[PDB]
Design a binder for this molecule. Structure first.
Ligand SMILES: CC(C)=CCC/C(C)=C/CC/C(C)=C/CONC(=O)CP(=O)(O)O
Lengths: 407, 323, 6
């Protein structure tokens, strides 16, 4: 009809999705309230300016922002000094999603650089001469993979890498994030992500790891960082993902998990929150929603007959709307929410989340949902590694040609 | 000695006592990527740190240097590590170090390194006396600090300091019953002390949870807890619940309430209850009210649930294709 | 700005 609003968030009924504090004010509610009111302005901006809303993904703008960042950064990116590989990844991936080609000049430099970040003992540090750490190592790999050149691949010292992973393995199945570092579910995921891609997984490498991960699932249905801790998207993702690689998804109560994640999508905002009763955030568009594809794959493997054949178990339209309308910086780059500044981390994940929301794929079945202008469509991303599915396959294949270190 | 923010602060290259050392530049290679254009101070300190690290100079001055690098980028784990090394090597006073770290945490509480450092300290000292109160203070600034909570859990656990936590939990819930972290904590405490099997406890909890729901029916946290504490044993296992929930529908409804109901029916149908069909329909009706009106954001989930329930609990589900 | 994941 004519009076019909195609945008879910703008529909008059949608207003009923505003918070009901039950006249009981606590810090949690107030904060949520502030956010909702701010988001409201965003939604209503079209109405009050008297313009018909057009959802446009500022590709050009984002590309420029990325393009430059890949080369150099201001004194503001100082505290990210121990996490440079992440920058490489966040950016490269973001470009890959945007379908921007990678010049071989760039590629080679990235390689050489990452080489400089490779520790003599295996694994990668957050900068040349820094000690190796699982997070930068995960990043380094994913990055090198997005490139996929033989050069890129040959950078990685698989033997050392494996040794490294072992030096971090814990008796209770967990892993340190680095020598003398801390332990939580991230380590498991990083160790797995890289181990699988590089084909270095030995029989005992992940002994008990799955069970450790399992113990992180809590009463909320989600997953905490370590047994006993509150459920959180990042950790939840890390956990599931790790388990999916370990092919041990079954070790979890996938039901409660599902119910948990789906409840994380903010009714009014459309985007996802990291943990129950906290604020929404762009990054979670991936961290949280990325779980759906994982779950779908897992449940389906259990012959789950009730599974949809065209959508993920979250409001794809609403996520996409949130992203587009509130997480884009005019000058380029993406963000947490309105009022927050852009940064590569959010740019990377908001996009990833977006791609996910537009791309449904379960075997032969494929169905997209592209809100706004069709130029908005992105390259698909793999739900486990969060890199181009093609890159995944390309990578694994190449590495399977190699023998698991030691034989 | 000379605070990094001190007006008289001087670059290490302009420091006499450091004249014997040649700074090590960052080896970024011929044609850099993600090159940070560090400020003078920054580049200077780390250039010097790089040196001491390389030389593995385990000196007092090195110790003081680390404080600086940290102040610059407290996320630099390599620095942290080396600092621990120096603490051991230099036989530094750990309490003095505690003072230090507590200050640091206070300023950048949302960092991994800082916490892990304090953890290690406490471990070395085998002294938790300061922990709780400290953590409280941090939590008093951000009642949802994930790192702090995690630390607290670790502490209480390693030092069996359970005695006063529930009391704490209670206080926080009073301040903000919507604090999910607290709800997790409460479950953490109970699980490891009395356990939930103890019926008097179970009961007490539920009373309290319902009482909370009554006061704030829209607080998704209480609901999640409630579900959290009864689900494993089986929702059907507690018949009065259903009736009791139905009673709140009038002046205390919410998509949460409706949802819970579906979970109950779900479990009831799982444990082959009376009026198989009657329940089933009540459930599907709800899946619809949720998917179409009361909780559309989760339409895809709701459609799936109803579809699953239909898939295994319709009168036709156990009936052969030929009938 | 900082990196909240490590
Ligand atoms: C592969 C990796 C490294 C995954 C980690 C992803 C995430 C998102 C980890 C989160 C760690 C965490 C919970 C830090 C505590 O501070 N974070 C917040 O408080 C953010 P919010 O308010 O949204 O919970």
């Amino acid at each position: 009809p004519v009076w019909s609003e195609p945008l879910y968030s703008l529909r008059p009924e949608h207003a009923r999705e505003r918070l009901q504090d039950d006249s009981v004010e606590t810090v949690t509610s107030i904060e949520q309230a502030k956010v909702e009111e701010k988001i409201q302005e965003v939604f209503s901006s079209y109405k009050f300016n008297h313009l018909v809303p057009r959802l446009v993904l500022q590709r050009e703008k984002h590309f420029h922002y990325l393009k430059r960042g890949l080369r150099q950064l201001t004194d503001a990116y100082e505290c990210l000094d121990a996490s440079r590989p992440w920058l490489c990844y966040w950016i490269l991936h973001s470009l890959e999603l945007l379908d921007e080609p990678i010049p071989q000049i760039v590629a080679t430099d990235v390689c050489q650089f990452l080489e400089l970040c490779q520790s003599p003992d295996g694994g990668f540090g957050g900068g040349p001469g820094q000690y190796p750490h699982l997070a930068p190592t995960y990043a380094a790999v994913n990055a090198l993979c997005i490139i996929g050149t033989e050069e890129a691949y040959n950078v990685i010292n698989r033997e050392k890498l494996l040794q490294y992973l072992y030096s971090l393995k814990q008796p209770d199945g967990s892993f340190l994030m680095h020598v003398g570092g801390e332990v939580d579910v991230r380590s498991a995921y990083c160790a797995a992500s890289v181990a699988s891609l590089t084909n270095i997984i030995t029989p005992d490498l992940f002994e008990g790891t799955a069970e450790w991960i399992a113990r992180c699932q809590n009463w909320e249905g989600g997953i905490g960082g370590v047994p006993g801790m509150e459920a959180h998207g990042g950790y939840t993702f890390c956990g599931l993902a790790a388990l999916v690689i370990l092919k041990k998804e079954r070790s979890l109560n996938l039901k409660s998990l599902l119910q948990w994640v789906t409840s994380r999508q903010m009714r009014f905002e459309g985007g996802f929150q990291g943990r129950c009763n906290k604020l929404v955030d762009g990054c979670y568009s991936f961290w949280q929603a990325g779980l759906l594809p994982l779950l779908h794959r897992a449940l389906h493997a259990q012959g789950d007959p009730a599974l949809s054949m065209s959508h993920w178990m979250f409001h794809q339209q609403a996520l996409q709307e949130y992203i587009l309308m509130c997480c884009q910086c005019p000058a380029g780059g993406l963000l947490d929410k309105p009022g927050k500044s852009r940064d590569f981390y959010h740019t990377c994940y908001c996009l990833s989340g977006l791609s996910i929301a537009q791309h449904f794929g379960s075997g032969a079945m494929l169905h997209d949902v592209v809100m706004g202008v069709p130029e908005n469509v992105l390259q698909p991303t793999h739900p486990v590694y969060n890199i181009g599915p093609d890159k995944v396959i390309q990578a694994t294949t190449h590495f399977l040609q190699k023998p698991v270190p030691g034989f | 000695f000379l605070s990094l923010d001190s007006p008289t602060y001087v670059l290490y290259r302009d420091r006499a006592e450091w004249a014997d050392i040649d700074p090590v530049p960052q080896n970024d290679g011929p044609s850099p990527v993600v090159q940070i254009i560090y400020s003078e101070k920054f580049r200077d300190v780390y250039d010097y740190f790089r040196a001491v690290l390389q030389r593995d100079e385990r000196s007092e001055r090195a110790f003081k240097l680390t404080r600086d690098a940290i102040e610059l980028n407290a996320a630099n784990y390599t620095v942290w590590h080396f600092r621990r090394v120096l603490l051991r090597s230099l036989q530094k006073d750990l309490q003095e170090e505690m003072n230090y770290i507590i200050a640091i945490i206070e300023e950048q509480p949302k960092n991994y390194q800082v916490w892990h450092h304090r953890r290690v300290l406490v471990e070395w000292l085998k002294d938790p006396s300061q922990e709780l109160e400290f953590i409280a203070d941090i939590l008093n600034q951000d009642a949802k600090n994930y790192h702090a909570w995690q630390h607290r859990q670790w502490v209480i656990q390693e030092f069996r300091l359970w005695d006063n936590e529930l009391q704490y939990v209670d206080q926080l819930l009073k301040e903000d019953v919507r604090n999910n972290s607290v709800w997790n904590q409460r479950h953490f405490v109970i699980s490891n002390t009395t356990g939930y099997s103890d019926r008097a406890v179970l009961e007490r909890e539920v009373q309290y949870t319902l009482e909370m729901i009554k006061l704030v029916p829209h607080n998704e946290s209480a609901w999640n807890y409630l579900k959290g504490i009864l689900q494993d044993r089986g929702l059907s296992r507690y018949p009065n619940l259903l009736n009791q929930l139905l009673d709140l529908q009038p002046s205390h409804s919410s998509p949460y309430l409706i949802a819970f109901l579906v979970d109950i029916y779900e479990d009831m149908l799982e444990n082959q209850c009376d009026n198989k069909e009657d329940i089933l329909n009540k459930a599907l009706e709800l899946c619809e009210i949720l998917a179409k009106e009361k909780d559309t954001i989760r339409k895809e989930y709701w459609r799936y649930i109803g579809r699953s329930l239909q898939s295994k609990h319709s009168r036709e589900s156990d009936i052969p294709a030929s009938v | 700005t900082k990196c909240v994941i490590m």
